[PDB]
Design a protein around this nucleic acid. Structure first.
Lengths: 117, 50, 139, 132, 201
RNA sequence: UUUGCUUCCCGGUGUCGGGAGGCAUCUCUAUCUCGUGGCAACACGAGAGCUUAUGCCCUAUGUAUGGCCUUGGCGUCGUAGUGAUUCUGCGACGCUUGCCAACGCCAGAUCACUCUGGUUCAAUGUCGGGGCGCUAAAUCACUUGCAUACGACUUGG
RNA sequence: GCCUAACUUCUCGCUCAUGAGACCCCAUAAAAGGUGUUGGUUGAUAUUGACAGCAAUCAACUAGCCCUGAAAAUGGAUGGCGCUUAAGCGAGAGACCUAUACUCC
RNA sequence: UACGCCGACGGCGUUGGCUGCUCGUUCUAGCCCGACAGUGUUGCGUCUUGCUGGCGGUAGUGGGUUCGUGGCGGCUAGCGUACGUCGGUGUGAAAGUCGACG
């Protein structure tokens, strides 16, 4: 039976991992740069400071996490937005582990918590 | 765009599709030839001409 | 010490759940539990299937909608220990508290002239649509 | 080819910058880029603005070169420029966007329901018309 | 900021380098980009400047073996493709993968003949001073060796005729829709009230 | 390819990746839209920050019973059209899909969030069953000489 | 602007070059010219109507950008792509990016 | 239960980043009044209405500029643990799960 008000859409903002904090011949993999959808200013980018972010990717070995009923090939790297970057709405993020370079251009989910609205 | 072959192709014309004509079963255009005397095949050929 | 409640969170306020299996659901906030500091909330289990449980304010968006919550009398045995964790099965005791708490809440919504939208609003899950940017949305 | 012009007394609409969204009257023209405007009755102080931030409206006041704020106020109120401007689709769209930007979640839900019901009914009517 | 689908851009009245840099950034950020009517892209400056620049480009060929030298593409689509290639790190894996996501065409292929195309106003040719000459990449390609200017012209004419017919039909349907809303007014009055109150109409 | 095998469907099972839906005129930029008169050029009337892609559609509990409203989507099939091969219109037939009484009534809960949309979607490989369905060629060695360092090329059984 | 982290950000001008120009050392350019255009200096005439033809004009200078002076051998270099109310030249304004430097842990 | 190995949310300490109100301080007006001079001037000529300039007034009203051994906020980061509230895992095997390397 239909579960009485099922999920209807996203609860995250779409973003992409555009690269690491860098000069021109240096690179600091400790900090990542994200581009969010619909954000175009540092004023708007400041709204998301302190929000959690996640990167989901697919691995080979499956895992049956507690709270899951089916083995899944998806793993996650968690992080958090720390501050805006530049004038055009990019943000800086810090991840539990440095984001793999293979995530360039891949989806990053900007969650809405911890909330402060 | 398309190619329409004659209903009857000469043996020597069909040889050109082969490297071992003598050793083969010479099946080239055998199914295509039947299309000229078929209701659906005739329609397809007419559509190609159009 | 107990956590400081956000100014927007007052009894009867309708919140949006941001995490868990109930993420996106619109629920009703009853009171801040004294011991843990979490929020005792229950979007009427009848409407959206959200039972009577706790949730931290960090995982909630407080909207400007408020339902008349002055009629509900929370039983004294409903406290942090009551929700303290022990294959979960809903104890027959639990169901009765939900009926006790929700009954005045449901009646208040029904009396409200907007009961048609209020029931539908609480029975629907929030989601981010096309060209909907949280930094410009007024919740 | 050009109807509206930058002339003394022309009522301009501030499109970007400090007093965005308000109306003023051109009291002087300094050069090809700068105009002295003064919107006394629309909460705009007598200032000099670059024409890049301004947009011409259809209203022209009967002003004089460098009319003082008192005279500009008199002309503005006499012509009822604010009321006439509020009747244009230019102002109606601004009002609609102002309402839209401040919709609550409940209001958004109500709008969703009403909009889809109206669309369904209009589609039924359109099918009726199309069949005929 | 990724787009779910490919970004289909109508190249007409666009400045070559500006549009190329925008598209290169999008490709690097991971989107797929399709450019239509690449023969309608514009280059500022008189035609002689662009023609002589392309002639000097043609002069760059390996003395030992021209089959290794620079490959001078004449089609407008390939000209735009090479312009974008110039603004990518195409010698690296990142740049190569970015470039492989670009498709530039002359005219509108049947696959995209029924889709809406985008424009970049920051790359439009109307940001130039009106008293400044500009060249059309279609003419440049034709003068440097492109052989399909006439074919593309005929195909575009047919496409425009069909589009005009479709647009006439669409105008008729739009008028019918307006009439349908007017007819439904009494039934929808209850919902129109809320819609207008919340400011959507 | 007389066992082998194309194709469609049902199942297993390997490998792999992505990560919230849809949207068709053109031409023009020192003018444009609508209405009317015009063969046309053009003309008259009314408007026109233009922020209608800064938009518009879509947007969710299950019977029953009653009142409506009969539309929209999906699939197959059959015609007709479309040539820059797929995509459209028309049907015909199926599977569904809206609102009101009304959250009226039944179910829904995993204890506060940590990869589920709380079985996310795609791409293919392979192994089994079925449904229509088909029953080939290259190559070696000889031979030819228009060819040839050797391969290759041109011929025939 | 993209390579390339950071604005096709804001203000005023100048410049069209049949490959313009584009940032210390630095990776060449001169004497001499232009009725191209933009500013200035000086001396004149002009409403007792200035020059041309049967309402401003004339002359000489000056200096910004542009143009001529400006020819070399493998195909080639403002670093490349490209850029023309610039992504060039000059005066400026906000913000922003980035060291093994500075502050703190 | 406690304890290990990890995560989340709060508190506190430290170094911050962004962003508002509010008082005052310095140097100064405008608005307003008076005469005088001028003129990109409306309506019908030592006209009038405008507009400008300094000069003299400031009662009232009243903005710019400057910063304070000033006052009150909002959002948020790294590091550590005046410390709390909690979750995953691990107490025979084994499997799975968790953790660390890689």
């Amino acid at each position: 039976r239909r579960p009485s008000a099922p999920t209807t859409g996203r609860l995250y903002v779409k973003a992409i991992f555009t690269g690491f904090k860098r000069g021109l011949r240096t690179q600091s993999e400790h900090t990542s740069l994200l581009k969010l959808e619909g954000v175009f200013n540092k004023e708007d980018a400041g709204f998301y400071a302190g929000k959690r972010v996640v990167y989901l990717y697919k691995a080979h070995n499956k895992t049956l996490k507690t709270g899951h009923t089916v083995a899944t090939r998806t793993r996650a790297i968690w992080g958090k937005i720390t501050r805006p970057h530049g004038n055009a709405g990019a943000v800086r993020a810090k991840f539990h582990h440095n984001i793999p370079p293979s995530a360039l251009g891949k989806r990053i989910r900007v969650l809405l918590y911890p909330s402060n609205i | 765009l398309t190619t329409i072959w004659a209903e009857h192709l000469s043996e020597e014309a069909r040889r050109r599709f082969y490297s071992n004509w003598a050793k083969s079963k010479k099946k080239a255009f055998t199914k295509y030839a039947k299309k000229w005397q078929d209701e659906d095949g005739k329609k397809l050929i007419e559509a190609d001409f159009a | 010490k107990t956590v400081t409640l956000r100014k927007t969170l007052t009894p009867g306020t309708v919140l949006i759940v941001l995490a868990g299996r109930h993420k996106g659901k619109r629920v009703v906030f009853l009171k801040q539990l004294p011991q843990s500091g979490l929020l005792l909330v229950t979007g009427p289990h009848k409407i959206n299937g959200f039972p009577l449980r706790r949730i931290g304010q960090a995982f909630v968006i407080a909207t400007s909608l408020k339902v008349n919550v002055s009629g509900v009398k929370i039983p004294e045995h409903i406290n942090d220990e009551y929700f303290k964790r022990k294959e979960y099965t809903v104890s027959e005791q639990r169901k009765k508290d939900i009926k006790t708490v929700d009954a005045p809440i449901l009646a208040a919504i029904k009396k409200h002239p907007e009961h048609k939208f209020l029931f539908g609003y609480l029975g629907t899950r929030f989601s981010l649509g096309k060209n909907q940017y949280p930094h410009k949305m007024q919740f | 080819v050009f109807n509206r012009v930058v002339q003394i007394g022309r009522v301009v609409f501030i499109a970007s910058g400090k007093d965005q969204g308000k109306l003023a009257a051109i009291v002087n023209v300094i050069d090809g880029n700068r105009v002295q405007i003064d919107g006394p009755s629309s909460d705009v102080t007598r200032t000099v603005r670059n024409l890049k931030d301004l947009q011409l409206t259809k209203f022209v006041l009967k002003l004089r070169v460098g009319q003082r704020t008192k005279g500009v106020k008199a002309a503005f109120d006499a012509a009822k420029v604010t009321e006439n401007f509020q009747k244009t689709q230019w102002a109606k769209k601004i009002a609609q966007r102002a309402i839209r930007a401040k919709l609550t979640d409940f209001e958004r839900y109500k709008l969703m329901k009403a909009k889809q019901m109206r669309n369904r009914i209009v589609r039924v009517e359109l099918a009726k018309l199309k069949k005929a | 900021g990724l787009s779910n689908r490919a970004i289909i851009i109508d190249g007409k009245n666009h400045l070559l380098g500006r549009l190329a840099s925008i598209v290169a950034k999008k490709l690097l950020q991971g989107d797929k980009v399709v450019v239509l009517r690449a023969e309608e892209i514009v280059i500022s400056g008189n035609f002689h400047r662009s023609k002589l620049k392309y002639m000097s480009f043609l002069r760059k060929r390996c003395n030992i073996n021209p089959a290794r030298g620079a490959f001078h593409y004449r089609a407008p689509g390939k000209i735009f493709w090479r312009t974008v290639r110039g603004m990518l790190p195409h010698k690296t894996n990142r740049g190569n993968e970015a470039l492989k996501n670009l498709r530039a065409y002359e005219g509108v292929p049947a696959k995209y003949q029924k889709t809406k195309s985008l424009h970049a106003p920051s790359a439009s040719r109307f940001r130039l001073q009106p008293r400044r000459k500009f060249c059309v990449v279609g003419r440049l390609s034709h003068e440097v060796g492109w052989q399909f200017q006439d074919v593309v012209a005929k195909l575009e004419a047919k496409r425009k005729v069909k589009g005009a017919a479709y647009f006439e039909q669409k105008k008729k349907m739009d008028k019918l829709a307006v009439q349908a809303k007017k007819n439904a007014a009494p039934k929808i009055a209850q919902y129109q009230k809320i819609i207008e109150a919340l400011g959507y109409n």
